[PDB]
């Protein structure tokens, strides 16, 4: 990664490498894997990001999907940034291609060059954005249950029911308008007859705090 | 976090990330989770605070309640601070502000501690979660037939800490309800000590 001491390059630590490998093994592709990836890859170069992805042993179906997502974003970057032919007045430094941001066709020297330039071109953060975009699609697929199938049991506590609901809602990653539409009607609808009668008594515009406190 | 070496930014450590995750998994939402959160988020930016909350896997009901509490406090900040750049409620939460802007406010002179302000909102939301997750009520806490007084007092103040009443109400309970719900054997001895007796003197008497 690149860190202060002037911005200087450091090798990725054994602690960080092991921490990333263990969370992928243990949690598979649960929603909380994505924030942990972003945290462990703080100030990481494209080389460091590739190192973390390559060290993953299993889930090779998921890693092949992630590879395709990166290629799509890399191709999109090349389309939005055409290669300039004529002028070189200052002259300006070389612009990074999609493959240079991914780290496939760029050295560590070049990656540090872009990131520590003034103005800086944060290829590490741009590439991390593409990885997280690909990982979100993987988490959506690996979601075990659909939001519609989550229903409260006959004698299940309401707290445990709501935990499974919002865990499913987080995994599916719907729109904010779609989430609030489901959260409004589907949460109360799928609760048991005992709690359902109590929840409606509070009325419309009731917070989740009030709903959970009632059925307890 | 932001720390000395001049104030400079550092990446959140694996130790701090793992420590926070394990505390949430093990202790769920016991009162001692809040001081541990405050300790682990020492000098943390709004980004670092979001990272810690987002890394929590379970308890999504509680995290959704915390989300709503933050939005209320953010809305309240916008109300008390009209626009006329100064940080809005969403900027303090870290939803609509970059890391450079967050560092900018915190290291400014005078400084605007967006991390500590946002931490105040999170702890406020977490206190409401701890109060809800409390299993037993203080009125239910009674001394057993052959239970030691030490064990009875542990359960009394453990429950009292979880519910988080006002200091006037806590003292009202501590004075009256503590001796009231004790067993007849110790209750007689505690009243013999008289009013204004310290907890040390009360526990020593029924030992």
């Amino acid at each position: 990664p690149i860190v202060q001491n002037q911005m200087v390059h450091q090798c990725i630590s054994p602690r960080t490498l092991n921490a990333w490998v263990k969370v992928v093994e243990e949690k598979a592709f649960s929603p909380e894997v994505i924030p942990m990836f972003s945290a462990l890859s703080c100030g990481a170069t494209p080389q460091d990001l590739n190192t973390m992805l390559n060290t993953v042993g299993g889930h090779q179906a998921a890693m092949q999907m992630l590879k395709e997502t990166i290629n799509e974003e890399a191709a999109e970057w090349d389309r939005l940034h055409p290669v300039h032919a004529g002028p070189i007045a200052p002259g300006q430094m070389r612009e990074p291609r999609g493959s240079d941001i991914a780290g496939t066709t760029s050295t560590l020297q070049e990656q540090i060059g872009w990131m520590t330039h003034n103005p800086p071109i944060p290829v590490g953060e741009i590439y991390k954005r593409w990885i997280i975009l690909g990982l979100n699609k993987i988490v959506r697929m690996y979601s075990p249950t659909s939001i519609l199938d989550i229903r409260q049991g006959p004698k299940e506590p309401f707290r445990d029911y709501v935990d499974r609901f919002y865990k499913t809602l987080r995994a599916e990653q719907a729109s904010q308008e779609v989430k609030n539409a489901a959260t409004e009607t589907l949460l109360v609808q799928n609760a048991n007859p005992d709690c359902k009668t109590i929840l409606k008594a509070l009325g419309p515009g009731a917070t989740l705090e009030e709903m959970m406190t009632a059925c307890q | 976090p932001i720390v000395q070496n001049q104030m400079v930014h550092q990446c959140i450590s694996p130790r701090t990330l793992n420590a926070w995750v394990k505390v949430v998994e093990e202790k769920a939402f016991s009162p001692e989770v809040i001081p541990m959160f405050s300790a682990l988020s020492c000098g943390a930016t709004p980004q670092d605070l979001n990272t810690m909350l987002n890394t929590v896997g379970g308890h999504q009901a509680a995290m959704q309640m915390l989300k709503e509490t933050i939005n209320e406090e953010a809305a309240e900040w916008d109300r008390l601070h009209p626009v006329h750049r100064e940080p809005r409620g969403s900027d303090i939460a870290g939803t609509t502000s970059t890391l450079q802007e967050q560092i900018g406010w915190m290291t400014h002179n005078p400084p605007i501690p967006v991390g500590e302000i946002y931490k105040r909102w999170i702890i406020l939301g977490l206190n409401k979660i701890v109060r809800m997750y409390s299993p037993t009520s203080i009125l239910d806490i009674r001394q057993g037939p052959k239970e030691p007084f030490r064990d009875y007092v542990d359960r009394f103040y453990k429950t009292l800490r979880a519910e988080q009443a006002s200091q006037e109400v806590k003292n009202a309970a501590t004075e009256t309800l503590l001796v009231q719900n004790a067993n007849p054997d110790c209750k007689t001895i505690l009243k013999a000590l008289g009013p204004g007796a310290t907890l040390e003197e009360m526990m020593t008497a029924c030992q």
Partner: peptide
């Protein structure tokens, strides 16, 4: 494309 798992951000 999905929205995101980041509940706080």
């Amino acid at each position: 494309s999905p929205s995101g798992v980041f509940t706080f951000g």
